Amino acid sequence: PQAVVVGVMAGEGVQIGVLLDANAPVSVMTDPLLKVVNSRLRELGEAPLEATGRGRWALCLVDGAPLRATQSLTEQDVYDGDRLWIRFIADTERRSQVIEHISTAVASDLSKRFARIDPIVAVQVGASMVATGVVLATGVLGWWRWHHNTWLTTIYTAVIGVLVLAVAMLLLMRAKTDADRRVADIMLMSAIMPVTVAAAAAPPGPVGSPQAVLGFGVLTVAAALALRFTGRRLGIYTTIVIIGALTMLAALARMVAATSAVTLLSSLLLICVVAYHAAPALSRRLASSVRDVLLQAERARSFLSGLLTGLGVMVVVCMTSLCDPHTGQRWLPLILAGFTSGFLLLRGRSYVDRWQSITLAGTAVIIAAAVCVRYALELSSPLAVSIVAAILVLLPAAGMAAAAH
Amino acid sequence: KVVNSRLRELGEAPLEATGRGRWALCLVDGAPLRATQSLTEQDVYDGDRL
């Protein structure tokens, strides 16, 4: 325990293994330590470390934070096998600047800390507004189809779908920089909605199961096609494909023959339960030497995040549709929802990613809250709401308290 | 001997260890100095730390 071995990082990237005194204060070692790395660099034939103007030599963690000069290496949380970085930090001292006249003073100062609008951002705003505009247009046209079977909805939406996709193609080919790509992607993605309702609205007669088969089908196809030729925005497109696919299976079954919705909902729930365990494998198979490894790593990470999101959306819709405050053993789905939530609530810890872990943890909480709301709207009476309100506030309070306390 | 003698005057315990081995001078990285060569042969000058 009298000494510790650690890796020290030096100029341009050489790592050197050294056995340091575990109890002397850190300020005592930086100078001779610098000599040793320079000696090895000089014998190795590399360029030694050098000072520049005014500054000092400091020893920091790989995060960059310097260690307190007066404390012992054992007094700090540094263990054998860790690594450190030796660095030069320049002097920041300079004269102070004053401006008397408050009008000029406020103008000069305020222009430094905040960013003004520019022509690059101006385009992304317009691009976002056009996307919002068409998703509203499809909404009113779709609402009209719900009361009328005439071709108008498909006729007018079809032309919009063609126009938005046409414009998107030119932007994609003309692109030059990351900013240009962002604008192009936002525009193309906006084409999926008008095209989707354009097909689903074509089959005559009242709306329902028969039209549903077309809608979720063309939707899944378009999302997959965009992902293939674009190869960007992986996570969101992946989510659309999953939710679209599972809905198409349910739509086709209900359209062909189904004894009850409960049967379909129960089937979907079981499919999702097994899908959670397959998700990491699916994500993993879906994916100068350094480029291949990092590309593989980030591509893989993205697919899992999207895959988890798709499953989370389906279970809450299915689960909340299965439970009921009046039908039979009212308590059976309530406790079943609890057991189903427990698995998700506990398993979230197995993944290192922050957003992946948070989405899993969040998926369980929303189901419990949603179930209570359903049981509060229907079977409405002072006892029902009084119980639900107390439950909803105590529920998360206990969860955070158990973790923080 | 003089270091242990001085340590006792400071009230600190003398240098002591157990097991097969030996006592020697080392650099900040733990590398021991050469036992058969002069400090003038090695790169040692006034104010160095060991």
Binding site: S27, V28, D31, T70 | Y45, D46, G47, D48, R49
Partner: peptide, 18 residues
Amino acid sequence: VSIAEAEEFAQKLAQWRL
């Protein structure tokens, strides 16, 4: 400056001569 800082600087300076 502290006593430690003074001796640290003094040791660095002690290495050189005309």
